[PDB]
Amino acid sequence: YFGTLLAQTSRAWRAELDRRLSHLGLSQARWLVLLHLARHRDSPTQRELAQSVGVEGPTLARLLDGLESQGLVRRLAVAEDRRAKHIVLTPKADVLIADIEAIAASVRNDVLTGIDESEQALCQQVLLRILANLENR
Protein backbone atom coordinates (compact mmCIF):
# COMPACT_ATOMS: atom_id res chain seq x y z
CA TYR A 1 0.00 0.00 0.00
CA PHE A 2 2.41 2.44 -1.46
CA GLY A 3 0.00 5.37 -1.07
CA THR A 4 -0.39 4.60 2.63
CA LEU A 5 3.40 4.53 3.20
CA LEU A 6 3.66 7.94 1.50
CA ALA A 7 0.83 9.42 3.58
CA GLN A 8 2.21 8.05 6.83
CA THR A 9 5.73 9.36 6.14
CA SER A 10 4.31 12.78 5.19
CA ARG A 11 2.11 12.84 8.36
CA ALA A 12 5.08 11.86 10.54
CA TRP A 13 7.27 14.61 9.05
CA ARG A 14 4.57 17.30 9.44
CA ALA A 15 3.95 16.07 13.07
CA GLU A 16 7.63 16.49 13.80
CA LEU A 17 7.74 19.99 12.28
CA ASP A 18 4.53 20.91 14.20
CA ARG A 19 6.29 19.66 17.39
CA ARG A 20 9.42 21.74 16.74
CA LEU A 21 7.33 24.78 15.93
CA SER A 22 4.88 24.31 18.88
CA HIS A 23 6.39 27.19 20.96
CA LEU A 24 5.36 29.73 18.33
CA GLY A 25 1.60 29.36 19.07
CA LEU A 26 0.83 29.05 15.35
CA SER A 27 -1.92 26.55 15.63
CA GLN A 28 -3.83 24.70 12.97
CA ALA A 29 -2.00 24.88 9.70
CA ARG A 30 -0.91 28.48 10.32
CA TRP A 31 2.85 28.05 10.32
CA LEU A 32 2.55 26.14 6.99
CA VAL A 33 0.85 29.13 5.35
CA LEU A 34 3.79 31.33 6.61
CA LEU A 35 6.29 28.80 5.39
CA HIS A 36 4.74 28.76 1.93
CA LEU A 37 4.58 32.55 1.80
CA ALA A 38 8.22 32.70 2.77
CA ARG A 39 9.14 30.30 -0.02
CA HIS A 40 7.53 31.80 -3.04
CA ARG A 41 8.76 35.10 -4.50
CA ASP A 42 5.38 36.09 -5.92
CA SER A 43 2.61 37.12 -3.55
CA PRO A 44 -0.12 34.50 -4.04
CA THR A 45 -3.82 35.02 -4.31
CA GLN A 46 -5.94 33.13 -1.70
CA ARG A 47 -6.70 30.55 -4.39
CA GLU A 48 -2.99 29.95 -5.07
CA LEU A 49 -2.08 29.67 -1.40
CA ALA A 50 -4.90 27.23 -0.63
CA GLN A 51 -3.73 25.00 -3.51
CA SER A 52 -0.16 24.83 -2.26
CA VAL A 53 -0.77 24.73 1.51
CA GLY A 54 -3.29 22.01 0.75
CA VAL A 55 -6.51 23.26 2.26
CA GLU A 56 -9.95 24.41 1.07
CA GLY A 57 -10.46 28.17 0.54
CA PRO A 58 -12.82 28.79 3.50
CA THR A 59 -10.35 26.96 5.74
CA LEU A 60 -7.53 29.19 4.50
CA ALA A 61 -9.69 32.33 5.13
CA ARG A 62 -9.82 31.41 8.87
CA LEU A 63 -6.08 30.63 8.98
CA LEU A 64 -5.39 33.94 7.29
CA ASP A 65 -7.65 35.86 9.82
CA GLY A 66 -5.46 34.39 12.53
CA LEU A 67 -2.21 35.39 10.93
CA GLU A 68 -3.57 38.87 9.93
CA SER A 69 -4.77 39.42 13.53
CA GLN A 70 -1.16 38.82 14.65
CA GLY A 71 0.14 41.39 12.10
CA LEU A 72 2.00 38.65 10.12
CA VAL A 73 0.17 39.00 6.81
CA ARG A 74 -1.74 41.64 4.78
CA ARG A 75 -4.17 41.20 1.91
CA LEU A 76 -3.16 43.79 -0.71
CA ALA A 77 -3.32 44.75 -4.42
CA VAL A 78 0.04 44.23 -6.06
CA ALA A 79 -0.27 45.65 -9.60
CA GLU A 80 -2.18 48.10 -11.79
CA ASP A 81 -3.67 44.87 -13.32
CA ARG A 82 -3.59 42.68 -10.21
CA ARG A 83 -6.27 44.31 -8.17
CA ALA A 84 -7.45 41.17 -6.35
CA LYS A 85 -6.12 40.70 -2.87
CA HIS A 86 -2.72 39.03 -2.70
CA ILE A 87 -1.31 37.74 0.54
CA VAL A 88 1.86 39.45 1.56
CA LEU A 89 4.11 39.00 4.60
CA THR A 90 4.89 41.90 6.86
CA PRO A 91 8.30 43.06 8.16
CA LYS A 92 7.03 41.89 11.58
CA ALA A 93 6.84 38.40 10.20
CA ASP A 94 10.54 38.21 9.25
CA VAL A 95 12.10 37.19 12.59
CA LEU A 96 9.34 34.64 12.72
CA ILE A 97 9.85 33.18 9.21
CA ALA A 98 13.61 33.07 9.80
CA ASP A 99 13.01 30.87 12.85
CA ILE A 100 10.46 28.67 11.07
CA GLU A 101 12.83 28.09 8.15
CA ALA A 102 15.74 27.30 10.45
CA ILE A 103 13.56 24.76 12.30
CA ALA A 104 12.21 23.27 9.03
CA ALA A 105 15.89 22.88 7.86
CA SER A 106 16.67 21.09 11.12
CA VAL A 107 13.81 18.58 10.65
CA ARG A 108 14.93 18.05 6.97
CA ASN A 109 18.51 17.40 8.09
CA ASP A 110 17.45 14.94 10.72
CA VAL A 111 14.82 13.00 8.72
CA LEU A 112 17.34 12.60 5.79
CA THR A 113 19.90 11.03 8.11
CA GLY A 114 21.49 7.97 6.54
CA ILE A 115 19.88 8.55 3.11
CA ASP A 116 22.26 8.82 0.19
CA GLU A 117 22.09 11.96 -1.98
CA SER A 118 21.57 9.77 -5.10
CA GLU A 119 18.77 7.86 -3.53
CA GLN A 120 17.11 11.09 -2.35
CA ALA A 121 17.27 12.31 -5.96
CA LEU A 122 15.78 9.08 -7.26
CA CYS A 123 13.02 9.23 -4.60
CA GLN A 124 12.19 12.78 -5.75
CA GLN A 125 11.99 11.73 -9.42
CA VAL A 126 9.51 8.92 -8.49
CA LEU A 127 7.36 11.38 -6.48
CA LEU A 128 7.48 13.97 -9.35
CA ARG A 129 6.14 11.32 -11.82
CA ILE A 130 3.37 10.31 -9.44
CA LEU A 131 2.42 13.95 -9.10
CA ALA A 132 2.48 14.49 -12.91
CA ASN A 133 0.33 11.37 -13.33
CA LEU A 134 -2.12 12.91 -10.92
CA GLU A 135 -1.95 16.43 -12.35
CA ASN A 136 -2.25 15.12 -15.88
CA ARG A 137 -5.67 13.61 -14.88
Residues 80-93 as b/e (b if ≥16 CB within 10 A, e otherwise) read eeeeeebbebeeeb
CA distance 64 to 59: 9
Residues 18-29 as b/e (b if ≥16 CB within 10 A, e otherwise) read bebbeeeebeeb
- Range 52-81, binding a copy of itself (CB under 8 A): 52, 54
18 or 68: whose CB is closer to Zn ion? 18
Nearest 5°: CA angle at 11, between 68 and 55? 40
Stretch that binds a copy of itself, among 22-30, 61-69, 91-99, 119-127 (CB under 8 A): 119-127
Stretch that binds a copy of itself, among 23-31, 41-49, 80-88, 101-109 (CB under 8 A): 101-109
Residue from 22, 27, 106, 124 that binds Zn ion (CB under 5 A)? 22
Judged by CB under 5 A, does residue 128 bind Hg ion?
no
Residues of the shown chain interacting with a copy of itself in the complex, contacts defined by CB under 8 A: 1-17, 39, 52, 54, 104, 107-108, 110-115, 119-120, 122-131, 133-135, 137
